[PDB]
Amino acid sequence: GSSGSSGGKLSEHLRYCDSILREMLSKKHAAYAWPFYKPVDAEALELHDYHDIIKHPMDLSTVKRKMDGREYPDAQGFAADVRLMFSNCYKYNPPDHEVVAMARKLQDVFEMRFAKM
Fold first, then answer.
1. Distance in angstroms (rounded) separating the CA atoms of residues 110 and 24
2. For the domain that residue 48 is a member of, what is the CATH number?
3. Where does cross-link Glycyl lysine isopeptide (Lys-Gly) (interchain with G-Cter in SUMO2) occur?
């Protein structure tokens, strides 16, 4: 769609939300939105007790698939997942981690958007 995400098989709100995600997946926000572009493999990676701290991990790629299959019953469900994705980074990574400053930049946008809707 151009200058407007033509709804379709989506809740009055969802239809709009579906976009909020397509935006966060832009090369522009990537600078601080990439931290959630690739998956996480404790086995392969040399992480340190990843699962331990983060029991229910999340990632952009994940939320998308869910939104693609209309898995979300409403806007709440969709947004919910997104919220977690952040809380995770803010939990796993320390308060001195640069990634923490980047994530925010995204969250700030994810908030206003949801509001404008």
1. 8
2. 1.20.920.10
3. 116
In one letter, which amino acid is 83?
R
Q: Cβ–Cβ contacts within 10 Å for residue 93, how many? A: 15
> Which three-class secondary structure state does DSSP give residue 83?
helix
Experimental method: NMR
- Provide the domain limits for residue 10: 1-117
What does the DSSP assignment read for 23-69? Answer: HHTSHHHHHHHGGGTS---TTTS--SSHHHH-SS---HHHHHHHHHT
Report in angstroms the alpha-carbon separations of 68 from 57, 96, 112. 19, 35, 23
Both structure tokens of 46: 């040399």
